Amino acid sequence: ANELTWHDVLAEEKQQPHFLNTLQTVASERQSGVTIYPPQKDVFNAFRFTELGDVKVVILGQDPYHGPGQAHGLAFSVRPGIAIPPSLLNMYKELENTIPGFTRPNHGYLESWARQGVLLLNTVLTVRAGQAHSHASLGWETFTDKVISLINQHREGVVFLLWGSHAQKKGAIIDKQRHHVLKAPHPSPLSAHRGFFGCNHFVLANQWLEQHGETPIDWMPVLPAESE
Ligand X SMILES: O=c1cc[nH]c(=O)[nH]1
- Please give the positions annotated as active site: 63
Pick from 6, 47, 65, 208: which binds ligand X (CB under 6 A)? 65
Nearer to ligand X, 18 or 133 (CB): 133
Specify whether the CB–CB gap between 142 and 136 falls below 8 A: no
Q: Which residues face 184 on adjacent strands?
A: 163
d(CA 76, CA 38): 12
Nearer to ligand X, 121 or 217 (CB): 121
Residue 174: Cβ within 10 Å count: 18
62 lines the binding site for ligand X (CB under 6 A): yes
Nearest residue to ligand X, scored by beta-carbon proximity: 61
Pick from 38, 64, 105, 171: which binds ligand X (CB under 6 A)? 64
Where does this chain touch ligand X (CB under 6 A) — which range of 28-36, 61-69, 93-101, 142-150?
Answer: 61-69
Binding to ligand X (CB under 6 A) within 41-60 occurs at: none
Q: Which residues contact 101 (CB under 8 A, 6 or more apart)?
A: none
Binding to ligand X (CB under 6 A) within 72-131 occurs at: 75-76, 87, 122
Nearer to ligand X, 22 or 62 (CB): 62
Nearer to ligand X, 122 or 206 (CB): 122
Residues that bind ligand X (CB under 6 A): 61-62, 64-65, 75-76, 87, 122
